[PDB]
Amino acid sequence: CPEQIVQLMHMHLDGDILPKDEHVLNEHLETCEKCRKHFYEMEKSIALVRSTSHVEAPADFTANVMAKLP
Amino acid sequence: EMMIKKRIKQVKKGDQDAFADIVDIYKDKIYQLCYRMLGNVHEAEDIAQEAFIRAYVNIDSFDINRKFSTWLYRIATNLTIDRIRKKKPDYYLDLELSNTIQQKILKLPDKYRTVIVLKYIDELSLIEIGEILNIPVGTVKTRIHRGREALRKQLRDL
Ligand SMILES: [Zn+2]
């Protein structure tokens, strides 16, 4: 198992992977149940923290800020 | 933006009302940043307000040529980092889905928590995250790789 491979997993997720390096990564995931599982676990986690982009400022937030100003 | 700079120009010259436009445009983003860093509604609204008030107070210090949001985020990030550290007791010596995500976000060290929230919740670039945190683009990349790995340990089992 090349210790290099998680660096490939991360370059992929950065949108940074080389076209050459992408083919190498794809080849290893296909023949490695532990490196699919690792890469599947990061993608899941990313997906789950992306589903928390819904927060908005409480009611009358602006009005509160403007009264607090000098 | 074109609009915000124009609003900033009004603020500097005496027009306090024109700041309200700056608050509306960024209120949700800034409150969201503090709430996902702190995980508590009461401290979030507090620090989000302080960031905007501090932004107004120091508006003349702001370089008009640089991006304003980057400036405002830096203020908010520094207030929340500071609060997170204050909580740590030894500081002055020396099954709902998104709430489960939230509580797992708080188990990340502030240096990885920041980049994950800015990159994955707030959808900023590495270049802008660096500017906000005053660290090289290389270092932010590294922190994200570590954050993704820390995040994986916490969230895989959901
Ligand atoms: Zn492997």
Numbering used by the authors:
A (entry chain C): 3 to 72
B (entry chain A): 2 to 95, 124 to 187
What did the publication describing this PDB structure actually write?
SigW is one of ECF sigma factors in the gram-positive model bacterium Bacillus subtilis. Its activity is suppressed by the anti-sigma RsiW under normal growth conditions. The cytoplasmic domain (RsiWcyto) interacts tightly with SigW to inhibit SigW activity. In the structure, RsiWcyto interacts with the groove formed along the surface of two domains in SigW (σW2 and σW4), resulting in the burial of the promoter binding area of SigW.
Rod-shaped crystals grown in the condition containing polyethylene-glycol 3350 as a precipitant diffracted up to 2.8 Å resolution. Thus, the structure was determined by the multi-wavelength anomalous dispersion (MAD) method, using a crystal of selenomethionine-labeled SigW/RsiWcyto. The residues of two SigW/RsiWcyto complexes in the asymmetric unit (residues 3-95 and 125-187 in SigW and residues 3-72 in RsiW) were traced into the electron density and the final model was refined with R/Rfree values of 21.0/28.7%. Two SigW/RsiWcyto complexes in the asymmetric unit are superimposed with a root-mean-square deviation (rmsd) of 0.7 Å for 224 Cα atoms, indicating that the two complexes have the same conformation. The x-ray emission spectrum measured in the synchrotron facility revealed that the crystal contains zinc ion bound to SigW/RsiWcyto. In the structure of RsiWcyto, the zinc ion is coordinated by residues C3 in L1’, H30 in α2’, C34 in L3’, and C37 in α3’. The three N-terminal alpha-helices (α1’-α3’) form a helical bundle and coordinate a zinc ion. By contrast, RsiWcyto interacts with SigW by wrapping the surface of SigW, resulting in a large surface burial of 3324 Å2. The surface binding area of SigW/RsiWcyto is divided into three binding motifs of RsiWcyto. Taken together, anti-sigma RsiW inhibits the promoter binding of SigW by directly blocking the binding surface of -35 element in σW4.
